[PDB]
PDB file of C-alpha atoms (C1' of nucleotides) in Angstrom:
ATOM      1  CA  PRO H 241     121.737  83.163 173.943  1.00  0.00           C
ATOM      2  CA  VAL H 242     125.385  82.190 172.671  1.00  0.00           C
ATOM      3  CA  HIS H 243     124.419  79.262 171.415  1.00  0.00           C
ATOM      4  CA  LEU H 244     122.060  81.331 169.153  1.00  0.00           C
ATOM      5  CA  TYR H 245     125.737  82.619 168.449  1.00  0.00           C
ATOM      6  CA  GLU H 246     127.317  79.814 167.784  1.00  0.00           C
ATOM      7  CA  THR H 247     124.238  78.124 165.934  1.00  0.00           C
ATOM      8  CA  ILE H 248     124.689  81.139 163.170  1.00  0.00           C
ATOM      9  CA  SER H 249     127.941  80.852 163.308  1.00  0.00           C
ATOM     10  CA  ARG H 250     128.013  77.045 162.244  1.00  0.00           C
ATOM     11  CA  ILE H 251     125.577  78.105 159.511  1.00  0.00           C
ATOM     12  CA  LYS H 252     127.374  80.148 157.958  1.00  0.00           C
ATOM     13  CA  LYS H 253     130.553  77.705 157.891  1.00  0.00           C
ATOM     14  CA  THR H 254     128.451  75.066 156.895  1.00  0.00           C
ATOM     15  CA  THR H 255     126.606  77.486 154.220  1.00  0.00           C
ATOM     16  CA  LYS H 256     130.492  78.553 152.774  1.00  0.00           C
ATOM     17  CA  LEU H 257     131.710  75.007 152.695  1.00  0.00           C
ATOM     18  CA  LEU H 258     128.128  73.585 150.641  1.00  0.00           C
ATOM     19  CA  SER H 259     129.046  76.464 148.130  1.00  0.00           C
ATOM     20  CA  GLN H 260     132.808  75.901 147.475  1.00  0.00           C
ATOM     21  CA  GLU H 261     132.215  72.027 147.816  1.00  0.00           C
ATOM     22  CA  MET H 262     128.555  72.589 145.226  1.00  0.00           C
ATOM     23  CA  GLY H 263     130.097  75.650 143.296  1.00  0.00           C
ATOM     24  CA  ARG H 264     127.454  77.545 143.735  1.00  0.00           C
ATOM     25  CA  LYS H 265     124.890  78.606 145.545  1.00  0.00           C
ATOM     26  CA  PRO H 266     123.170  76.387 149.125  1.00  0.00           C
ATOM     27  CA  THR H 267     119.093  76.654 149.549  1.00  0.00           C
ATOM     28  CA  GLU H 268     117.537  76.495 151.535  1.00  0.00           C
ATOM     29  CA  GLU H 269     116.188  72.464 151.955  1.00  0.00           C
ATOM     30  CA  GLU H 270     119.931  72.045 151.259  1.00  0.00           C
ATOM     31  CA  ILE H 271     121.536  73.829 153.862  1.00  0.00           C
ATOM     32  CA  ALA H 272     118.472  72.449 156.454  1.00  0.00           C
ATOM     33  CA  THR H 273     119.693  68.922 155.613  1.00  0.00           C
ATOM     34  CA  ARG H 274     123.460  69.174 155.641  1.00  0.00           C
ATOM     35  CA  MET H 275     122.637  71.190 159.509  1.00  0.00           C
ATOM     36  CA  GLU H 276     119.750  68.549 160.331  1.00  0.00           C
ATOM     37  CA  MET H 277     117.444  70.764 161.590  1.00  0.00           C
ATOM     38  CA  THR H 278     113.695  72.123 159.676  1.00  0.00           C
ATOM     39  CA  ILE H 279     113.685  74.401 157.674  1.00  0.00           C
ATOM     40  CA  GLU H 280     111.433  76.184 159.252  1.00  0.00           C
ATOM     41  CA  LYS H 281     114.263  76.333 162.344  1.00  0.00           C
ATOM     42  CA  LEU H 282     116.530  77.997 160.156  1.00  0.00           C
ATOM     43  CA  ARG H 283     113.637  80.898 159.092  1.00  0.00           C
ATOM     44  CA  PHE H 284     113.387  81.586 162.123  1.00  0.00           C
ATOM     45  CA  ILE H 285     117.587  81.810 162.876  1.00  0.00           C
ATOM     46  CA  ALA H 286     117.419  83.975 160.281  1.00  0.00           C
ATOM     47  CA  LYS H 287     114.890  85.690 161.409  1.00  0.00           C
ATOM     48  CA  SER H 288     115.843  87.173 164.785  1.00  0.00           C
ATOM     49  CA  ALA H 289     119.903  87.189 163.804  1.00  0.00           C
ATOM     50  CA  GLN H 290     118.323  90.762 162.496  1.00  0.00           C
ATOM     51  CA  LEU H 291     119.540  94.169 163.595  1.00  0.00           C
ATOM     52  CA  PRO H 292     116.869  96.232 164.581  1.00  0.00           C
ATOM     53  CA  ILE H 293     116.829  99.478 162.782  1.00  0.00           C
ATOM     54  CA  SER H 294     116.699 103.349 163.944  1.00  0.00           C
ATOM     55  CA  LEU H 295     113.202 104.963 164.400  1.00  0.00           C
ATOM     56  CA  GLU H 296     114.624 107.274 163.539  1.00  0.00           C
ATOM     57  CA  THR H 297     116.908 105.800 159.525  1.00  0.00           C
ATOM     58  CA  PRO H 298     115.527 108.690 156.476  1.00  0.00           C
ATOM     59  CA  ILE H 299     113.380 107.719 154.210  1.00  0.00           C
ATOM     60  CA  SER H 305     112.167 112.186 157.091  1.00  0.00           C
ATOM     61  CA  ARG H 306     112.454 109.773 159.908  1.00  0.00           C
ATOM     62  CA  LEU H 307     111.115 106.055 160.033  1.00  0.00           C
ATOM     63  CA  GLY H 308     109.024 106.620 163.409  1.00  0.00           C
ATOM     64  CA  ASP H 309     106.983 109.369 161.683  1.00  0.00           C
ATOM     65  CA  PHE H 310     105.807 106.790 159.762  1.00  0.00           C
ATOM     66  CA  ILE H 311     104.511 103.713 161.824  1.00  0.00           C
ATOM     67  CA  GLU H 312     100.560 103.512 163.035  1.00  0.00           C
ATOM     68  CA  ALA H 313      99.838 103.688 167.009  1.00  0.00           C
ATOM     69  CA  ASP H 314      98.955 100.690 168.846  1.00  0.00           C
ATOM     70  CA  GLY H 315      94.795 101.002 170.303  1.00  0.00           C
ATOM     71  CA  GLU H 316      91.451 101.031 168.943  1.00  0.00           C
ATOM     72  CA  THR H 317      90.566 103.973 166.340  1.00  0.00           C
ATOM     73  CA  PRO H 318      88.165 106.266 167.756  1.00  0.00           C
ATOM     74  CA  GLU H 319      86.014 105.311 165.150  1.00  0.00           C
ATOM     75  CA  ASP H 320      85.964 101.518 166.101  1.00  0.00           C
TER      76      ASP H 320
ATOM     77  C1'  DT X   1      -7.669 113.987 183.033  1.00  0.00           C
ATOM     78  C1'  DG X   2      -5.263 113.928 179.036  1.00  0.00           C
ATOM     79  C1'  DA X   3      -1.338 114.308 177.657  1.00  0.00           C
ATOM     80  C1'  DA X   4       3.490 115.121 176.333  1.00  0.00           C
ATOM     81  C1'  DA X   5       8.325 112.601 177.536  1.00  0.00           C
ATOM     82  C1'  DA X   6      11.252 109.801 179.449  1.00  0.00           C
ATOM     83  C1'  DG X   7      12.380 105.244 180.707  1.00  0.00           C
ATOM     84  C1'  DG X   8      11.821  99.993 180.235  1.00  0.00           C
ATOM     85  C1'  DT X   9      11.295  95.297 177.994  1.00  0.00           C
ATOM     86  C1'  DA X  10      11.635  91.347 175.225  1.00  0.00           C
ATOM     87  C1'  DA X  11      13.492  89.972 170.874  1.00  0.00           C
ATOM     88  C1'  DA X  12      16.112  89.644 165.804  1.00  0.00           C
ATOM     89  C1'  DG X  13      20.062  90.338 164.010  1.00  0.00           C
ATOM     90  C1'  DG X  14      24.255  90.844 164.163  1.00  0.00           C
ATOM     91  C1'  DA X  15      29.827  91.301 164.973  1.00  0.00           C
ATOM     92  C1'  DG X  16      33.021  89.657 167.707  1.00  0.00           C
ATOM     93  C1'  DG X  17      35.460  86.552 170.497  1.00  0.00           C
ATOM     94  C1'  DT X  18      36.547  81.452 171.400  1.00  0.00           C
ATOM     95  C1'  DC X  19      35.743  77.065 170.626  1.00  0.00           C
ATOM     96  C1'  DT X  20      36.628  72.275 167.472  1.00  0.00           C
ATOM     97  C1'  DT X  21      39.125  69.380 162.959  1.00  0.00           C
ATOM     98  C1'  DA X  22      43.177  67.583 158.456  1.00  0.00           C
ATOM     99  C1'  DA X  23      47.206  68.688 156.572  1.00  0.00           C
ATOM    100  C1'  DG X  24      51.819  69.610 156.532  1.00  0.00           C
ATOM    101  C1'  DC X  25      55.685  70.777 159.060  1.00  0.00           C
ATOM    102  C1'  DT X  26      59.954  70.967 161.963  1.00  0.00           C
ATOM    103  C1'  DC X  27      62.575  69.991 166.213  1.00  0.00           C
ATOM    104  C1'  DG X  28      65.036  67.302 169.806  1.00  0.00           C
ATOM    105  C1'  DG X  29      65.949  63.193 171.674  1.00  0.00           C
ATOM    106  C1'  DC X  30      68.075  59.144 170.996  1.00  0.00           C
ATOM    107  C1'  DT X  31      71.863  56.268 169.510  1.00  0.00           C
ATOM    108  C1'  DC X  32      76.197  56.315 167.991  1.00  0.00           C
ATOM    109  C1'  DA X  33      80.722  56.587 164.966  1.00  0.00           C
ATOM    110  C1'  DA X  34      83.869  60.014 164.641  1.00  0.00           C
ATOM    111  C1'  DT X  35      86.425  62.642 166.263  1.00  0.00           C
ATOM    112  C1'  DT X  36      88.918  66.797 169.744  1.00  0.00           C
ATOM    113  C1'  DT X  37      91.019  68.459 175.315  1.00  0.00           C
ATOM    114  C1'  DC X  38      93.313  66.236 179.055  1.00  0.00           C
ATOM    115  C1'  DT X  39      96.433  64.176 181.639  1.00  0.00           C
ATOM    116  C1'  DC X  40     100.369  62.510 182.815  1.00  0.00           C
ATOM    117  C1'  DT X  41     104.471  60.376 181.687  1.00  0.00           C
ATOM    118  C1'  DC X  42     109.038  60.535 178.986  1.00  0.00           C
ATOM    119  C1'  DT X  43     112.178  63.158 176.623  1.00  0.00           C
ATOM    120  C1'  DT X  44     114.363  67.377 174.846  1.00  0.00           C
ATOM    121  C1'  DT X  45     116.269  70.933 173.688  1.00  0.00           C
ATOM    122  C1'  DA X  46     116.746  76.121 175.532  1.00  0.00           C
ATOM    123  C1'  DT X  47     119.750  78.526 178.503  1.00  0.00           C
ATOM    124  C1'  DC X  48     123.298  79.843 181.647  1.00  0.00           C
ATOM    125  C1'  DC X  49     128.320  78.300 184.196  1.00  0.00           C
ATOM    126  C1'  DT X  50     133.448  77.114 184.074  1.00  0.00           C
ATOM    127  C1'  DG X  51     137.613  76.172 182.220  1.00  0.00           C
ATOM    128  C1'  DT X  52     141.780  77.124 177.579  1.00  0.00           C
ATOM    129  C1'  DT X  53     148.418  76.778 179.140  1.00  0.00           C
ATOM    130  C1'  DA X  54     154.330  77.532 173.075  1.00  0.00           C
ATOM    131  C1'  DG X  55     154.254  83.541 173.064  1.00  0.00           C
ATOM    132  C1'  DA X  56     151.941  87.653 172.248  1.00  0.00           C
ATOM    133  C1'  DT X  57     151.644  94.139 176.267  1.00  0.00           C
ATOM    134  C1'  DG X  58     148.940 102.229 173.773  1.00  0.00           C
ATOM    135  C1'  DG X  59     143.885 103.360 168.100  1.00  0.00           C
ATOM    136  C1'  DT X  60     141.675 104.694 163.667  1.00  0.00           C
ATOM    137  C1'  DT X  61     139.648 107.887 161.382  1.00  0.00           C
TER     138       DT X  61
END
DNA sequence: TGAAAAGGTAAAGGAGGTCTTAAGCTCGGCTCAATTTCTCTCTTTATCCTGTTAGATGGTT
């Protein structure tokens, strides 16, 4: 959602501002405090911002190394 | 008529099942703290929608 894009942009801007102010890469807790949000929310945003990798990425393709969901004939 | 030859009867004894207690256990109920669901409120976000007035006007690899 658009609000998520705006949240990610604000997180990037805050991180750059803290890096400029403190002269070093900010930690997760520092960013979470500055954003006034829990660290778990920040990690959730970071995980949801990822781009999906295509199944045909060379490793040979990625799609030939992923098992299938089901009950093993043995089970 | 005498005599096998089988068929009964009354015991003794054993074999087997069925009853009785002293010892011990463990099992459920009862109480009674000590708590996890539930169901309302009561918020609080999560998601979508609309608008923005200097001027700008044909692609990169």
